[PDB]
Amino acid sequence: DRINTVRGPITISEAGFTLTHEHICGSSAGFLRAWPEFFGSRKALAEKAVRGLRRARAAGVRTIVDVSTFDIGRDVSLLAEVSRAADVHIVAATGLWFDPPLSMRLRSVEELTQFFLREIQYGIEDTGIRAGIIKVATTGKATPFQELVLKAAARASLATGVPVTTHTAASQRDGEQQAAIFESEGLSPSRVCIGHSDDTDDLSYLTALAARGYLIGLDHIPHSAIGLEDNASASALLGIRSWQTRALLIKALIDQGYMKQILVSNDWLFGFSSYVTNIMDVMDRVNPDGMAFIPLRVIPFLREKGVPQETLAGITVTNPARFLSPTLR
Amino acid sequence: DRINTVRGPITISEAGFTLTHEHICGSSAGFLRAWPEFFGSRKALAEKAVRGLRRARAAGVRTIVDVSTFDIGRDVSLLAEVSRAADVHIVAATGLWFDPPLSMRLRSVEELTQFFLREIQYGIEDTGIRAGIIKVATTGKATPFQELVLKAAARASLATGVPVTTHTAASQRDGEQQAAIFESEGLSPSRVCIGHSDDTDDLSYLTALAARGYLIGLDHIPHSAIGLEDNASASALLGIRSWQTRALLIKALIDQGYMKQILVSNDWLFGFSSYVTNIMDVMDRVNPDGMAFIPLRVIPFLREKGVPQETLAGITVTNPARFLSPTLR
Ligand SMILES: CC(C)OP(C)(=O)OC(C)C
Ligand SMILES: CC(C)OP(C)(=O)OC(C)C
Ligand SMILES: [Zn+2]
Ligand SMILES: [Zn+2]
Ligand SMILES: [Zn+2]
Ligand SMILES: [Zn+2]
């Protein structure tokens, strides 16, 4: 019925055009509060985000899902402030990424479940703001600990109806292992989005998952270091595939009949401390459009390639709504 | 002249009897704020802390140095509140322990130096509370990252006059490698305390460091899993040496003429999320006196073994004062 945002619940219809995998800032737990100057200042970062969000809004974006977890240094108060200022709905997340500290690493599946439930039902920290999605991650074969996270994610999802979204090493076919664990927990694939999937050309892997009912997250569209092979770091992070290559995966999937399972995003951010210093400058240079890249560049591209507008609408509006709506078995 | 506490600056004479290595809570960055229930509640935690500190106070303790760093989940606000409620001075720290997140791990020596200076000169987070010591750590051979931390620590210390305190794997003689790094930066050994030193029976290793001017932190006195071998985790953590054995190392160093180089503490805490669940219960069983363990058990013990009261005062009052007084080269 309603979706939880950092400004409160909204109805499904209010979501509109939704960006399913983004971040206001890519950092680490407590970092923003401890060293705000790393980003110039907390104010500068907030202003940058507001400007960026206003531009996306102008382009038609109504809602963004910030998949930053506790370990990504998610600052809900920051999200709330920019959401209000830019007038864009922001869905917050619970879960864990791949940089959990000891206090989390030593927890049991039952403990983690309570933590995720807390964030979803009671709210994040003492803000009362509730998470509307669960974010998990692997980078190749799951670690024992990651396995636990995935199972807790599944349990929390089963109890609340909130969807699960993931970070993968697409090349390594991570999605397969992820799906296995989720299924082992009784989780419906329809409540799951396998992300960073445009990161591989293996359409075999993609349609497999798709065929199984999973949602495929093509959210790295603008990530490309083409013309930046000069920069090791950037190259490592962005890849050398062009944006068009990635964009074409969307078309392929549609072509195979999997339009209802696609989710597109940019995996953009306004601040990034969990990487080399100054990487942001590099990113901004690569994609000055920021989060508006999708509506301004990708949609028209697909249009020109033959994709019916109607279909594009389904992918950017219908799919996200369906995915985000809390649903129990 | 003055020492920075969580309630502000105090004169040296005001420190009095000081415990140089303690913790209010052992956690991780942002954990206490995101999952207070882990400790029952923040209120419960604070109360436990206040009680414990009042007991130590009753015993004669005037000041404690909380060596919790950003990665130990140090919460200065929590420190300030308990300090106020118990009426015990608390010195906060900057530096990094062994659980740094990606945002920290990827920083250069220069960046780290900045961060450390920030905490000491400007203050922690947005509180204005300034650190009065730098905490570093190794657990066996230093990692490349740890070497940078050590260098930054030294530079920050050289610029401010604030002492450096460390966590070591004593049995592995970590102190030797730490000293080497420090000296390479030009730091005076007299500004450094090599901690967890009572964790080894190798007096030769201890005396060699003392001879060089370093301070030796005998801060694990009450850590003993004796009579609990039935518990792996605990044994693993506390060891099987008796408190008397550790205490005797204090007398040994004295006997060898290094009384001015000794610092003693408990390495106690009131909450501990960075270990197995329920570890606190075990610890409280092991040492019901908590931080008062030193004045209530150790001092008397030492007296009884021939250590003159005066010497005992020098160790618990004078050494810490000299150590803590910001001192530039
Ligand atoms: C740190 C990088 C290498 O991983 P990623 C792309 O998931 O980071 C998020 C936080 C944007
Ligand atoms: C986590 C343990 C094993 O290391 P330690 C003794 O430095 O922890 C402190 C911060 C209480
Ligand atoms: Zn990711
Ligand atoms: Zn992401
Ligand atoms: Zn330690
Ligand atoms: Zn300690």
What would you say the CATH architecture of chain A is?
Alpha-Beta Barrel
Q: Looking at the chains present, what oligomeric state does this protein adopt? A: homodimer
- Major sheet summary line of chain A: 6 strands, parallel
Series of secondary-structure elements of chain A, N-terminal to C-terminal: EEEEHHEHEEHHEHEHEHEHHEEHHH
Helix content of chain A: 40-55%
CATH topology of chain A: TIM Barrel
Shape of chain A: globular
Q: Biggest interface, and residues per chain?
A: A-B, 33 and 33 residues
Return Rg of chain A in Å: 18 Å
User: What's the arrangement of strands in the largest beta sheet of chain A?
Assistant: 7-8-9-10-11-12
Quote the distance from N terminus to C terminus of chain A. Answer: 15 Å
The domain count of chain A comes to: 1
Report the CATH C-level class of chain A.
Alpha Beta
Alpha plus pi helix count of chain A: 13
Q: In CATH, what is the homologous superfamily of chain A?
A: Metal-dependent hydrolases
- The percent range for strand residues of chain A is 5-15%
Query: How many strands of chain A?
Result: 13
Ligands bound, unique: methylphosphonic acid diisopropyl ester, zinc ion
Membrane topology (chains A, B): Peripheral membrane protein
Binding site for Zn(2+) 2 (chains A, B): 135, 167, 196
Keywords (chains A, B): Cell membrane, Hydrolase, Membrane, Metal-binding, Plasmid, Signal, Zinc
GO molecular function (chains A, B): aryldialkylphosphatase activity; zinc ion binding
